Amino acid sequence: DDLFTTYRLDLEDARSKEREELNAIVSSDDATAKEKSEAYDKMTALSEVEGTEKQLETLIKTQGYEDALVNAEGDKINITVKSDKHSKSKATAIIDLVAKEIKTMKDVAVTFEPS
């Protein structure tokens, strides 16, 4: 058991399926304009979510965290960081890496896992 690698794997799997379905609707003769349009938006947002998570993870790591994991997909942003010590200090420096429009619109949670 290693929870990070399992999660990343399952997330990917899930994301893949997601893209495939979005693409499937967008590409389909039986979708309406509305439906194509919305599937298309969900598709491009997902990429941006993808980009947001990769960048956030990279940034945290640069702040001296050994590994980090970030899921920015829903109403909340979940961020899990490998670390033995955790504090209000440490958490707030991580939350500072997140975009304003995210923090304005969404909750953000940061969990520190024993390394």
Partner: protein
């Protein structure tokens, strides 16, 4: 509409705000203090926490008139009540010990709807109520809207 946003309490003078809504541009200290701490989880505060000087129970009441769309005991949050108002606006009261309403109840402004209590979620705010104002689902700073007409709320974003 037509009414002003009220402190969600009956005896507003005997309580103080013990936690504020998280603001990204506040000093480090104020950001640190607007955090919800669970275990080794931190989360952003999406409202204010009110508690009485000696953390005694106190009655919570509807900040504005509306319809109770939610009223249930949550094992982490305590009781949670959510009141629907006009225009995708709505308010949330949570950490309650008791509830004096149920789903579908119409309440009026200042009508008591529950009692403060302690919580699993924010044990740090002791005996309190967590209060939130949301517009179409998104939480805004309560303090920004206190005593302002209903409209001053629906005129952000801009």
């Amino acid at each position: 509409s037509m009414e002003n946003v009220a402190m969600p309490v009956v005896d507003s003078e005997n309580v103080s705000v013990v936690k504020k809504f998280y603001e990204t541009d506040a000093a480090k200290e104020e950001k640190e203090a607007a955090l919800v701490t669970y275990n080794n989880t931190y989360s952003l505060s999406k409202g204010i926490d009110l508690a009485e000087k000696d953390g005694k129970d106190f009655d919570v009441s509807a900040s504005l008139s509306g319809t109770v769309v939610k009223a249930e005991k949550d094992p982490v949050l305590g009781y949670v009540v959510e009141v629907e108002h006009a225009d995708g606006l709505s308010t949330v009261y949570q950490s309650l010990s008791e509830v004096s309403v149920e789903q579908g109840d119409k309440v009026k402004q200042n009508q008591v709807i529950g009692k403060s209590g302690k919580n699993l979620y924010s044990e740090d705010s002791g005996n309190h109520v967590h209060f939130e104002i949301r517009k179409d689902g998104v939480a805004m700073n309560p303090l920004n809207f206190m005593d302002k007409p209903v409209s001053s709320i629906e005129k952000a974003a801009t």
